[PDB]
Amino acid sequence: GREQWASRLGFILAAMGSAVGLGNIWRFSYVTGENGGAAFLLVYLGFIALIGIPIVLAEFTIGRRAQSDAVGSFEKLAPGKPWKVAGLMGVAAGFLILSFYGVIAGWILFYLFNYITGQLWSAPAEGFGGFFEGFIANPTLPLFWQALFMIATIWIVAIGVKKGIERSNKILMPLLGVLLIALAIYSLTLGGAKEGLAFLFSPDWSALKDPGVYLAAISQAFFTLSLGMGALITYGSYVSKDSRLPGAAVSVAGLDTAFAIIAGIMIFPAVFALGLSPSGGPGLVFVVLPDIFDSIRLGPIVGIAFFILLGAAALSSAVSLLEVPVAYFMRKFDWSRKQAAITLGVIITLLGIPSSLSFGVLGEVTIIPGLNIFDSVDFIASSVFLPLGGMIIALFIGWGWKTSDALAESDLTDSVWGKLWILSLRFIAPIAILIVFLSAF
């Protein structure tokens, strides 16, 4: 008696709700800002089309065919084979990513609280940078705001696939999109549009000589798509026998890429208008956007609505993160859904506390040479586990299945896209990820 998405539209909304989150605005802004902008963008865009779309389809195909969790989908489709390592790494990557994801999601609830309590309406004397720096440097407060978010994340995954994840507000993600477009229009009028549009859309190939911008591009590509973390295999697992998988893949990435491009038109024109540097770091959007909201007469209302819609999309992305280990520990250890959700949830919360302290007391502590605790947990998950875990998934469909099985389960039997899709999984994606791995390291 295994669960499945009750409604018909629930699967694509859940996958979109998984993809559209903090990686589109927070991470995309500062990863693009410190990687040169336009040149990094085109490489990132080319990775999404060539590699992101096939892997999104590939993860959908594995889960729907096997109807099991992340690891058990490889045990059923290929028993006694080492392909399951991609499922193991994905479970670990979701564990690592969720730990610091809730921390950033704690920053959002804290800013939402301030707007709701009239704090951040006008500019504090320390400035929005000093207010942000002073808040992240505080040890206790972000832990408290990380906890509240994880509780809501735990609450939803414990309720179930049908009653919780499936039952979500359809309006919030378009509301967020409507709010981003309106904010993008306003940012063009601030005076830094030309400076920002040049940084964002005029390629400077000088920054392309470093092979690290490809690694950072493939990292943001897989992060924003929820790939390599067992999410889409799991959301594909609860899918009925008849459903259109290819169009879901293009809708997920197409909508997601639309949400990321608009986030660049809002941030970078606003960055240059304030005279800031695009390579500030993780707190780029937390120091820029409050500056921009304060320029608005009704900015407090804009800020309240902004951190509500963004917080809900971050809520749906973390729910898709927590669902992967819960699904594994349910089948493996016979844990109840509530027990697995609370246990893993509190565990991942404690694992994310070291990432939160790296912005304050633990700033000078590094694990990977030159990278603090937060940058090292992110780098291992995003830049190492996600591509390497995604390469094996591609090789799994390209060389572990017979072609008729892949095209049939992917519904690409009678189309030209099946030929280009198999080409990408067998050669394009695994070789390109390999070349990026060899070049960066």
Q: Does 317 bind Na ion (CB under 5 A)?
A: yes
Label residues 207-236 b or e (16+ Cβ within 10 Å = b). bbeeebbbbbbbbbbbbbbbbbbbbbbbbb
Residues 6+ apart with CB under 8 A from 438: none
Q: Which does 110 bind (CB under 5 to 8 A by kind): Na ion, ligand LMT, ligand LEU, none?
A: ligand LMT
Q: Which does 202 bind (CB under 5 to 8 A by kind): ligand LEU, ligand SOG, ligand LMT, none?
A: ligand SOG
176 or 229: CB nearest ligand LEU: 229
Distance of CA 253 to the CA centre of its chain: 12
Closest approach, Cβ 141 to ligand LMT, in A, equals 5
Closest approach, Cβ 385 to ligand LMT, in A, equals 31
Rounded (10°) angle between helices 284-295 and 245-274: 70
- Give the tokens for residue 334: 């016979």
126 or 204: CB nearest ligand LMT: 126
What's the maximum distance between 2 C-alpha atoms anywhere in the chain?
65
Q: Using the rule CB under 6 A, which residue among 97, 158, 287, 429 binds ligand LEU?
A: 97
Q: Does 321 bind ligand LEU (CB under 6 A)?
A: yes
DSSP 109-142: HHHHHHHHTTSSSSPPTTHHHHHHHHHHH-SHHH
Give me the residue label for tokens 């804009």: 302
Q: Does 224 bind ligand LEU (CB under 6 A)?
A: yes
- The secondary structure element, H or E, covering residue 149 is helix 140-159
Q: Does 45 bind ligand LMT (CB under 6 A)?
A: no
Tell whether the torsion through CA atoms of 154, 382, 175 and 115 is positive or negative: positive
Closest approach, Cβ 39 to ligand SOG, in A, equals 9
Quick note: the x/- pattern for ligand SOG over 150-189, rule CB under 6 A, is ----------------------------------------
Please calculate the CA angle 300-32-322 and round it to the nearest 5 degrees.
70
Calpha distance 140→356 (Å, rounded): 9
250 or 305: CB nearest ligand LMT: 305
Q: What's the one-letter identity of residue 162?
A: K
Calpha distance 391→20 (Å, rounded): 23
Q: Does 320 bind ligand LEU (CB under 6 A)?
A: yes
Q: Does 201 bind ligand SOG (CB under 6 A)?
A: yes
Q: Does 191 bind ligand SOG (CB under 6 A)?
A: no
Calpha distance 322→284 (Å, rounded): 26
Quick note: the x/- pattern for ligand LMT over 135-154, rule CB under 6 A, is ------x------x------
Closest approach, Cβ 181 to ligand SOG, in A, equals 11
Q: Using the rule CB under 6 A, which residue among 47, 110, 272, 396 binds ligand LMT?
A: 110
214 or 259: CB nearest Na ion: 259
Of 83, 86, 104, which Cα lies nearest the Cα of 94? 86
Calpha distance 383→43 (Å, rounded): 15
109 or 432: CB nearest ligand LMT: 109
Q: Using the rule CB under 6 A, which residue among 143, 198, 346, 388 binds ligand SOG?
A: 198
Calpha distance 382→24 (Å, rounded): 14
Contact residues toward Na ion (CB under 5 A) are: 17, 19-21, 23-24, 224, 256, 313, 316-317
Contact residues toward ligand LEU (CB under 6 A) are: 18-19, 21-24, 97, 101, 223-224, 226, 229, 317, 320-321
Contact residues toward ligand SOG (CB under 6 A) are: 194, 197-198, 201-203
